[PDB]
Design a protein around this nucleic acid. Sequence first.
RNA 1: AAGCUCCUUCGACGAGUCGAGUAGUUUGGGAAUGCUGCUCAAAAUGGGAGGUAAAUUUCUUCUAAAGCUAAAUACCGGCCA
RNA 2: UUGACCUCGGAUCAGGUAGGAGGACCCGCUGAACUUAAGCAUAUCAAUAAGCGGAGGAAAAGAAACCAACAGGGAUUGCCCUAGUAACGGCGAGUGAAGCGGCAACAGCUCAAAUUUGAAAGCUGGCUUCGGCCCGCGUUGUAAUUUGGAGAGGAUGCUUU
Lengths: 220, 183, 183, 88, 50, 117, 121
Amino acid sequence: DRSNIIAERKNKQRVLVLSSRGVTYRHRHLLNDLASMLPHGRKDAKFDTKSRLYELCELAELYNCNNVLFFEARKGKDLYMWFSKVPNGPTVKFYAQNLHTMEELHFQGNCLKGSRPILSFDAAFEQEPYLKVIKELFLHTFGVPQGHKKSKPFIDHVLSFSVADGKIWVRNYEIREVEKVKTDINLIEIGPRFVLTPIIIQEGSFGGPILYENKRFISP
Amino acid sequence: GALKYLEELSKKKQSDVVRFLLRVRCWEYRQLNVIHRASRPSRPDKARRLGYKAKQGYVIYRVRVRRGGRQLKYQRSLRATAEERVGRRCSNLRVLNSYWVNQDSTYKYYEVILVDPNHKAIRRDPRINWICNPVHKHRECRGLTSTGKKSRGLNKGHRFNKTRAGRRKTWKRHNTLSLWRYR
Amino acid sequence: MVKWPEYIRLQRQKKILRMRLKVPPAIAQFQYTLDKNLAAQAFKLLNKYRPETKQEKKERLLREATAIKEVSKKPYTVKYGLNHVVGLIENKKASLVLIANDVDPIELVVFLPALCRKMGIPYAIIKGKARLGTLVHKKTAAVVAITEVRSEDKNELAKLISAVKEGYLEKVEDTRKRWGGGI
Amino acid sequence: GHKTTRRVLKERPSRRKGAQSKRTQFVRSLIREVAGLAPYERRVIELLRNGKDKRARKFSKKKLGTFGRAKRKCEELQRIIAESRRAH
Amino acid sequence: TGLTDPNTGKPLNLSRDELELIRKVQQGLIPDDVEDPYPDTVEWFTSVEE
Amino acid sequence: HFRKHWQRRVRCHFDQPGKKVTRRLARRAKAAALAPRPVDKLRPIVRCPTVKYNRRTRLGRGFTLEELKAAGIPRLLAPTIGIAVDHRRKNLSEESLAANVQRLKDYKARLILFPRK
Amino acid sequence: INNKEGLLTALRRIQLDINPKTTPFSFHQSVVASKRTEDSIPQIEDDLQRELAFMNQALEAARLGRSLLRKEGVPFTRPTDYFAEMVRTDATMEKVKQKLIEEATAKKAAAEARKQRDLKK
RNA sequence: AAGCUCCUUCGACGAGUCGAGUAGUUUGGGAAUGCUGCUCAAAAUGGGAGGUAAAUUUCUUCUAAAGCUAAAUACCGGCCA
RNA sequence: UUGACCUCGGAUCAGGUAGGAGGACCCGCUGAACUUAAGCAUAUCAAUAAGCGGAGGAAAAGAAACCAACAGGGAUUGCCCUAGUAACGGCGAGUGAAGCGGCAACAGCUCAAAUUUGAAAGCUGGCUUCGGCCCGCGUUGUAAUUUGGAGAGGAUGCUUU
């Protein structure tokens, strides 16, 4: 046994977070904030944009990771997300904006790194299928397997994914206990704030035939 | 075409024959002086592409420079310090160029090419007699060599906006209040 | 006790170090030099093909100019010059190559036994960069090549070439790929 | 925007300003054999001969610093293994 | 501590200063243990004659 | 914006009438040396880069090699008869080419050339 | 372009068998809320209401998850003795504690300025 | 000696340098804006900088680590007016 | 025994050169505080002053590893405008460009990478009847040819000293 899962049925998941060659400190801090939360992931930096998309696959095969979260930077100003099942599974592309990182002293919330989250989804993540595919991809990227030996055990935070206009808004809150008056959970927000606008669904790993197209996207 | 084979050898300087030669030469240079005269360049391909010629008037000087920090960092490079010490030693010559020749755990070793502006073999050659002009006195002190141009940021592009025409000249121009007659 | 001068001691310590360290097998092959008989028989042919000196080149020019005031074939000499000989090696225009064993930037001659092996030209590492320079009327000569000889001595050149591929390159065969020194 | 009759340009002689000549590739293959291998290249060659190709790509990446250079170095060292085996 | 030359030579006699100078540069010039640091040269390029 | 010492770095321009005299004397001094020749070299007609100024057209630096060969002027002669030559610029369209080989053909009609010695 | 059947086809190949029939809540810990939360938000520029809507969404996710987690039974609340490493640097909490000092001390010192000028009138 | 033309022939281009991590400095400029120091340390249908959601890094434009060069510009000093 | 070659030294040997001054303007190095923010530490002051090194009549820069996204521009420098724009900001203090455009002036080149190899063809000195003789440098490379919007070598025919 090599997958370090102590559970009745092992959820073998790994992610590989990556960066482009021109990200900003705001996009760099979202690597550090997301990877700190994400206990079964490896950090890597500065993928060559002159390479091809499917060289992100054997990069992840080199590190035994079935998920990849790529931060691609264009113009030195714009963050673009990529969630993908590495061998042959589907992928996604987002435009990320309205960034607010953990280093900014205005959130007043904190939690253990590596602790297991609760995934707080939205109602439209169930009824409409283009939200459903990214739902399973979000759930796998933040999978945090059961018997993972790098995970701290007590649960104190919940990740909230909600769609408002056409865009998904992420939220992170800390579970805190205040006793009821003759204990209820009060949420204090911890970490990353970003707004996630879908762009495409591709049926391949990083190419493959196009499945969803967001025909309302105003590019920067 | 022996020099094409030497250019590929300097590329592979961690390799077996080049690590051996750099080890046995760095040992020899430590017993020598801090600044001393070399009869021929240790890397004749590198010296020649930097301007060295086997003429009366061209000399090669080898210098070791202490390595490490000055966390204060010296903006003057170790190569520029290598040029400035030799030009002080040879006040009659002109520093043409310099190149890396060896390094150690304490020292870094450079070979500098110098040209005699008073030798009339040099004075008669149109390819080198520009250096006989007195605007080229002590080029290593004004940052006019290849190390100096790198550290002064004299490169084209939007990345070098503040330094491509002179950094202090740019600051004086931008900080000048210009008043005309018919305002 | 007594004290030795600085450059005196460094000459001996470099000799010890170059022969006792773990020498890579491109410098260690230079420790193997051809026999006294083969060197003498090589210079018997090569001295017959000595280049003309400056005194007798000027005399011949005065001879031909005089006859114009009041018919030859291609001159066969010994080819020299590192950049010239390497090109003659690369175009397969050379028949026998002689390489000095004491070139003090040794990088100028490290590739040269293996380059002659790749193109098939018989080579022999010889004692003396001074000896080859004497043969070619200079102070020094790193490499000496023969390309074509006159018809009176095509047989003794082919005999000398066979004496190199039998007397020198056969013994070098399983000892040119091995590291030198040790301890 | 505006429509113009685009011409066909003569080939710029600065295309591929590095090496594609057969002479330079001969020199690089000669110098690599006469000079030997770097200490980190001996590590990768040992791992590539032992089949640990997964470790070899990682090790070249930490030494060189870039995944693209790590692929090229492991490709070049793999060819050396191939042509050394044939000569043996 | 005389040790015989590896090329089947002769039991050497150099002074202690001569032995220390050998050990000084050998420490700076040694790849590692375990793997063979000094292999023979396989002529993978000069075996084929141009 | 007077936080720094703007007193020490203020430049007036009372030499504006005097520099104009020098500049006009430099053009007269140049025309004394090049007495039958024009002062300035011939320059090509080029289109301004951006979308803002695409419709405008200005003088460039020098004529392309294809423009010179189409007009019939050899390359090595053009700097010696008052034609500026740019090796960096390319033509990329027939409209840029045809406008300049008309200009060079018009230059040759108005040009009078004197023999060497 | 929104190919529908191929979209769910790709979902099958990465579908985990998340179902309370066999898989407990401890496996996935994923909660889908009944409220749309787009109906909760009247205007997207209302920063107070938009923050409350996402907070309210994570509210019922947290309470429902807490109830299911005790029914299966895991250690849910960190005890007083688990000195475990935070997702934030400790010094970051030190400077955010200093900022909460500065904001709150400014409010009460301004109230002292009120009482001085209440004497003035 | 030189320029052009044509071609069943060739066409070499700068390495402890790029680059990766890190510290200092600096800038309007965390593709570090630039530079310097330390550790490691490249390529050859190569390298650099851009453009682009447009479906894959498609296209665009230049060739770094060698060097020279008048003019338009500055000028509380030098010879004068 | 002799004679080279390399390397390191000596010489009141012959021929040269550097120092110091000046420093308004120019090129590098190093580098501060008050002040402002009605307190003050990031910041500003200021990449300034003081200190150190090095040049000229100008210096520096300079013939794209550039700008651009065009119907394209085309070395460097300076003026006007861009523009108190973009950008960065105890987002307070504030700091603060560049491309395009109109002008002034305009100029382009030298190497390394090649085998002259049917001829080191190159150069410093000395003696000189000034005409041409010796020594030395140099093959670990001095001339000629070439420098990537190129070029080489053949062939062919016109045109140039």
